[PDB]
Amino acid sequence: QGAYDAQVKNDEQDVELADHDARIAANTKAINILEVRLTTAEGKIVVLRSDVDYLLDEVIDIQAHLVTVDQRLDGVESDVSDIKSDYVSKTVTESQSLASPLDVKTSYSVDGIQVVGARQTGWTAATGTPLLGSFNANQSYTVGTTYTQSEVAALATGLEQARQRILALETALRLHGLID
Amino acid sequence: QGAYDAQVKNDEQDVELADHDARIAANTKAINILEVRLTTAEGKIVVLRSDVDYLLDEVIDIQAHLVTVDQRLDGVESDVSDIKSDYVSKTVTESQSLASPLDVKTSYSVDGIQVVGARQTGWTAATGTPLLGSFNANQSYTVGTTYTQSEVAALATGLEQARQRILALETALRLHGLID
Amino acid sequence: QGAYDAQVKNDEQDVELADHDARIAANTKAINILEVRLTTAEGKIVVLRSDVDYLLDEVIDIQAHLVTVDQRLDGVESDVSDIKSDYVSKTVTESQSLASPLDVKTSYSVDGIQVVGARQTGWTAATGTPLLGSFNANQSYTVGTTYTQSEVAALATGLEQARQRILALETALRLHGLID
Ligand SMILES: [Ca+2]
Ligand SMILES: [Cl-]
């Protein structure tokens, strides 16, 4: 019967409708689940990018700081190098020379013993013609048993020479500054 | 004609059911592809989170190290600065003054030439009253053809003056430390 | 009659098919929406990995740089320490000693006052026997009303002693280098 072949067909078609309904429902379920996982992933990505951006900016600053550090090191190393070559050392045994005059406080010492002190004052400067020429300290002066003008005159000359030689020595000390 | 399109609608309904079947399967396929891709994406996020966490911890330690570094830089710069102002320079042409006494080894030199050496020993100290007053080195002494007491006496006075002036010079050297 | 609810079953089945059609269509579109979001998410993950990989390598370089910095800091700190102990200070009040000879420019000074200058030239070296022995500066010389050989001779000896004492002093300055 044509109508009987309609309902048997209807029964088969509803079984198919049931199968489809379940399948569509499952697909919809999965999609909602996938969506949730996706939303969670998107959130973690946002936070990840926030952190990485912070790190990227932070590293940039670190490198800049490292540049300054390298520059400051270069600076202090440069000065130390300069100082090392320019400074007077207390343990070096080879002669050291200054390009300037020198001034110290109480005294100068050689080999632990004092050599030059402060300028000694209270002197009246001698006057005369300084004798820088030949000076014979072993010069002998003859004195006879009777008075001779030339002998005594020779004494006078030697005395005058001696006093002018003293002046020469004194002037030397004064020009150095050892005495006033 | 109840059997009609009861059967032809069944045909139409079956056509639509087959297409529905095809579409559901296609949707299922897509979901499966999405599921695989999402799972891969989620994993990479997990590893990313791990790496970023590591980077964050390493960077924090680095910043702490940089703090110590800046402090050490400040330290050495300060010290170099102190040294720069306090040290005696060998190339400076302007007069330099020490706050201390000074002791050197063999000798002191001026302009490459030795001026003061070690204290010279072996001296016997002269005795007397040093003459620090007026001393005329150009004093002339008259000697006549006949013996005159005042003339020879003046000679004696001049000699005594000279010798006491020598003592004054000698006293200066000993007080400085140039001789023992 | 059987055919009448054959058509009614068709009507009910049509509602279900229309519902299914919309539901499948909704799933399909939703999947396409997910794909777009997922593709965007994947892209950002790729860029994240690029940045993080860069940072990992960047951090490695930095730690290495930091090691060198500490090595350089130790070096300059050591050098400053060495320089600090070995250098001559302008502000130290305690006597400072050199293990070496010293040379300066124009002069040596004590307490702001010049003591030793450049070596004075133009001297002729005195000759004779230097008197380093006993020297009495307070020695008196008798001169009588009449010529006496021993008295005048004593004068001559006193003169010779003085001149030999001058020689001793001059020798001292010359040996030091204060004079040529
Ligand atoms: Ca049907
Ligand atoms: Cl579906």
From Swiss-Prot, chains A, B, C:
Trimerization heptad repeat repeats: 8-14, 17-23, 24-30, 31-37, 38-44, 45-51, 52-58, 59-65, 66-72, 73-79, 80-86
Keyword Amino-acid biosynthesis: no
Residues that bind Ca(2+): 10, 13
Compartment(s) of residence: Virion
Family: Belongs to the Lederbergvirus tail needle protein family.
Domain notes: the N-terminus forms the domain that binds to the tail hub protein and plugs the portal vertex channel, the middle coiled-coil rod, and finally a C-terminus distal tip that is a tight trimer of alpha-helical hairpins.
Protein name (database record): Tail needle protein gp26
Gene that encodes the chain: 26
